[PDB]
Design a protein around this motif. Structure first.
Motif: not given
Ligand SMILES: CCn1c2c(c(=O)[nH]c1=O)[C@H](c1ccc(C)cc1)C1=C(COC1=O)N2
Length: 127
Positions: A41-61
């Motif tokens: 899970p840590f080998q690439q930037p978090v792909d919030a779009v593909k992973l379906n996590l619409p709040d990931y980058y609202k929370i993690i700056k």
């Protein structure tokens, strides 16, 4: 939402160098964590779009990941080892903030972080 641009991994305006400690971080620390069963899970930037996590980058700056760290090391992006250690710590902290304690991904991160801290106690002296 779209994903953000990933963290930079090269910058011509940022001074760079090689040190025995950064070499160790690439050849031993990153190598060990990268190949670990829990690394993926840590080998690439978090792909919030593909992973379906619409709040990931609202929370993690302050996103960070081992794919980015690997490129920074390979590209000699860093000036000192502390920059790299800080990137690993940021990556773990993001996981602990976004996810619930006890979630499997938190347990994965904790196992990786335990290994990480062991390996950085083994950091060689600067030459
Ligand atoms: C690092 C970013 N990240 C991820 C997930 C998550 O729940 N929380 C999270 O912070 C998600 C996931 C779900 C369960 C397990 C056991 C591992 C990973 C996931 C990824 C990548 O592929 C995925 O399925 N990343």
């Amino acid at each position: 939402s779209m994903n953000p641009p990933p963290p930079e991994t090269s910058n011509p305006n940022k001074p760079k160098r090689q040190t025995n400690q950064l070499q160790y971080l690439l050849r031993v620390v990153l190598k060990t964590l990268w190949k670990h069963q829990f690394a993926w899970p840590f080998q690439q930037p978090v792909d919030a779009v593909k992973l379906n996590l619409p709040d990931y980058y609202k929370i993690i700056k302050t996103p960070m990941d081992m794919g980015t760290i690997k490129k920074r090391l390979e590209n000699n992006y860093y000036w000192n080892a502390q920059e790299c250690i800080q990137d690993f710590n940021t990556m773990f902290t993001n996981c602990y903030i976004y996810n619930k304690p006890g979630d499997d991904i938190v347990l994965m991160a904790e196992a990786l972080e335990k290994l990480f801290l062991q390996k950085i106690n083994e950091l060689p002296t600067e030459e």
